[PDB]
Design an enzyme around this catalytic site. Structure first.
Site, PDB file in Angstrom:
ATOM      1  N   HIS A  11       0.804  -1.230   0.000  1.00 52.09           N
ATOM      2  CA  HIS A  11       0.000   0.000   0.000  1.00 52.09           C
ATOM      3  C   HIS A  11       0.837   1.281   0.000  1.00 52.09           C
ATOM      4  O   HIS A  11       0.343   2.348  -0.363  1.00 52.09           O
ATOM      5  CB  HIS A  11      -1.059  -0.005   1.119  1.00 52.09           C
TER       6      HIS A  11
ATOM      7  N   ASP B  89      -0.855  -7.316   1.698  1.00 56.70           N
ATOM      8  CA  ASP B  89      -0.140  -6.045   1.768  1.00 56.70           C
ATOM      9  C   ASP B  89       1.358  -6.293   1.956  1.00 56.70           C
ATOM     10  O   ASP B  89       1.898  -6.164   3.054  1.00 56.70           O
ATOM     11  CB  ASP B  89      -0.710  -5.188   2.907  1.00 56.70           C
TER      12      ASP B  89
ATOM     13  N   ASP C 142       1.261   0.992  20.127  1.00 53.80           N
ATOM     14  CA  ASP C 142       0.889   0.520  18.793  1.00 53.80           C
ATOM     15  C   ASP C 142       1.915   0.971  17.758  1.00 53.80           C
ATOM     16  O   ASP C 142       2.717   1.874  18.006  1.00 53.80           O
ATOM     17  CB  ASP C 142      -0.491   1.084  18.406  1.00 53.80           C
TER      18      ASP C 142
HETATM   19  O1  7Y7 Z   1      -3.386   6.038  -0.609  1.00 50.46           O
HETATM   20  C1  7Y7 Z   1      -2.983   4.888  -0.641  1.00 50.46           C
HETATM   21  N1  7Y7 Z   1      -1.676   4.611  -0.434  1.00 50.46           N
HETATM   22  C2  7Y7 Z   1      -0.700   5.677  -0.194  1.00 50.46           C
HETATM   23  C3  7Y7 Z   1      -0.010   5.571   1.139  1.00 50.46           C
HETATM   24  C4  7Y7 Z   1       1.372   5.517   1.203  1.00 50.46           C
HETATM   25  C5  7Y7 Z   1       2.008   5.432   2.431  1.00 50.46           C
HETATM   26  C6  7Y7 Z   1       1.265   5.413   3.596  1.00 50.46           C
HETATM   27  C7  7Y7 Z   1      -0.122   5.475   3.527  1.00 50.46           C
HETATM   28  N2  7Y7 Z   1      -0.896   5.455   4.689  1.00 50.46           N
HETATM   29  N3  7Y7 Z   1      -2.029   6.242   4.932  1.00 50.46           N
HETATM   30  C8  7Y7 Z   1      -2.503   5.954   6.112  1.00 50.46           C
HETATM   31  C9  7Y7 Z   1      -1.683   4.954   6.689  1.00 50.46           C
HETATM   32  C10 7Y7 Z   1      -1.840   4.325   8.008  1.00 50.46           C
HETATM   33  O2  7Y7 Z   1      -2.708   4.709   8.780  1.00 50.46           O
HETATM   34  N4  7Y7 Z   1      -1.000   3.314   8.324  1.00 50.46           N
HETATM   35  C11 7Y7 Z   1      -1.002   2.603   9.534  1.00 50.46           C
HETATM   36  C12 7Y7 Z   1       0.228   2.281  10.110  1.00 50.46           C
HETATM   37  C13 7Y7 Z   1       0.309   1.585  11.281  1.00 50.46           C
HETATM   38  C14 7Y7 Z   1      -0.863   1.175  11.924  1.00 50.46           C
HETATM   39  N5  7Y7 Z   1      -0.823   0.486  13.093  1.00 50.46           N
HETATM   40  C15 7Y7 Z   1      -1.908   0.116  13.699  1.00 50.46           C
HETATM   41  N6  7Y7 Z   1      -3.155   0.366  13.215  1.00 50.46           N
HETATM   42  C16 7Y7 Z   1      -3.325   1.044  12.056  1.00 50.46           C
HETATM   43  O3  7Y7 Z   1      -4.439   1.262  11.613  1.00 50.46           O
HETATM   44  C17 7Y7 Z   1      -2.115   1.493  11.349  1.00 50.46           C
HETATM   45  C18 7Y7 Z   1      -2.180   2.208  10.150  1.00 50.46           C
HETATM   46  C19 7Y7 Z   1      -0.684   4.668   5.761  1.00 50.46           C
HETATM   47  O4  7Y7 Z   1       0.322   3.775   5.891  1.00 50.46           O
HETATM   48  C20 7Y7 Z   1      -0.758   5.554   2.298  1.00 50.46           C
HETATM   49  N7  7Y7 Z   1      -3.831   3.865  -0.876  1.00 50.46           N
HETATM   50  C21 7Y7 Z   1      -5.201   4.042  -1.104  1.00 50.46           C
HETATM   51  C22 7Y7 Z   1      -5.751   3.577  -2.293  1.00 50.46           C
HETATM   52  C23 7Y7 Z   1      -7.101   3.732  -2.543  1.00 50.46           C
HETATM   53  C24 7Y7 Z   1      -7.909   4.352  -1.607  1.00 50.46           C
HETATM   54  C25 7Y7 Z   1      -7.366   4.813  -0.420  1.00 50.46           C
HETATM   55  C26 7Y7 Z   1      -6.015   4.661  -0.163  1.00 50.46           C
END
Ligand code: 7Y7
Ligand code: CA
Ligand code: CL
Lengths: 57, 247
Positions: free
Chosen positions: B41, B90, B179
């Protein structure tokens, strides 16, 4: 054998036909004559932390 | 990383920092001198695939101390079954343009055999997760590399104590105190066994960093060992992005 206690192996384990077992080591390690232990053969083997390994050397 | 500590310089030598146009993108894990494992991702929105950089030996982002090694990314390999914007499958395998040089500060994490990882590593309770991600939900990212010890849950127990597929696992805490966090995706979940560390998970993403009642979701690396090993034996192909059949 490998399902229980990792077959006694430090790293990888393979079952064979009969009461047979073979341990193996990752690249950068060699298996000792005990048939279970793995010792580094290179300076920077995977999964070891140099500054901590030298701290106990 | 929320609720962890600074990883002392050199004690997380397999940690990778991924940059796009100089900006922090994601984490990664070195598994050999030219191969890095990360999360698929991280690359969903990459426009210019030729501005991707991997940095090894990084610790404090505010300074240059000479232990850092930067490499261009020559290939980004993602499973055919991965759907952009989702959690399942992922995982990404990155080929560097030139090998990194192994040093006290740059060392690969062992990619375990599948049987070993399933039979033994999967039952080691605690493992280390690391990165330069946010220190708090909705907070600033870390300047020094952070690390956190997290306990792994059986998928039955994750659902009870809280979808989650056989290609994932849960680890961490439900009380919101500790976390992985946004900015850490792609980084290692590293497991110790009899004096050696192994790659067991990749920081993926769920519905929120440090959310009460929810655990961190990690890509279950044991499902991909054979897939990764085959790709590492293969010749590079023109064009950075490669979608490879899974299984
Ligand atoms: O946009 C798209 N990709 C780009 C792209 C690049 C790098 C980082 C990201 N990116 N944005 C948000 C997060 C994120 O919250 N990560 C995260 C890390 C640790 C965690 N530990 C515990 N619980 C969690 O929930 C958790 C979550 C992330 O990593 C997106 N794709 C996409 C495609 C289509 C629709 C929407 C999104
Ligand atoms: Ca630095
Ligand atoms: Cl390209």
């Amino acid at each position: 054998i490998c399902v229980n206690e990792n077959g006694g192996c430090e790293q990888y384990c393979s079952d064979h036909t009969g009461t047979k077992r073979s341990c193996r080591c990752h690249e950068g390690y060699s298996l000792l004559a005990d048939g279970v232990s793995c010792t580094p053969t290179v300076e920077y083997p995977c999964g070891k932390i140099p500054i901590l390994e030298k701290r106990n050397a | 990383i929320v609720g962890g500590k600074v990883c002392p310089k050199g004690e997380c030598p397999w940690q990778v920092l991924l940059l796009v146009n100089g900006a922090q993108l994601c984490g990664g894990t070195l598994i050999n001198t030219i191969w890095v494992v990360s999360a698929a991702h991280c690359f969903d929105k990459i426009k210019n695939w030729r501005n991707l950089i991997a940095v090894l030996g990084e610790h404090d982002l505010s300074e240059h101390d000479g232990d850092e090694q930067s490499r261009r990314v020559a290939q980004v390999i993602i499973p055919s079954t991965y759907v952009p914007g989702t959690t399942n499958h992922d995982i990404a395998l990155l080929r560097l343009h030139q090998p990194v040089v192994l040093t006290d500060h740059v060392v690969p994490l062992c990619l375990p055999e599948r049987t070993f990882s399933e039979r033994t590593l999967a039952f080691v309770r605690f493992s280390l997760v690391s990165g330069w991600g946010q220190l708090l939900d909705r907070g600033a990212t870390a300047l020094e590399l952070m690390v956190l010890n997290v306990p792994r849950l059986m998928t039955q127990d994750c659902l009870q104590q809280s979808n989650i597929t056989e290609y994932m696992f849960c680890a961490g805490y439900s009380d919101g105190s500790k976390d992985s966090c946004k900015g850490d995706s792609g980084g290692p979940h590293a497991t110790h066994y009899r004096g050696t560390w192994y790659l067991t998970g990749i920081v993926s993403w769920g519905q929120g960093c440090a959310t009460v009642g929810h655990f961190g979701v990690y890509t279950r690396v044991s499902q991909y060992i054979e897939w990764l090993q085959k790709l590492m034996r293969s010749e590079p192909r023109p064009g950075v992005l490669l979608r490879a059949p899974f299984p």
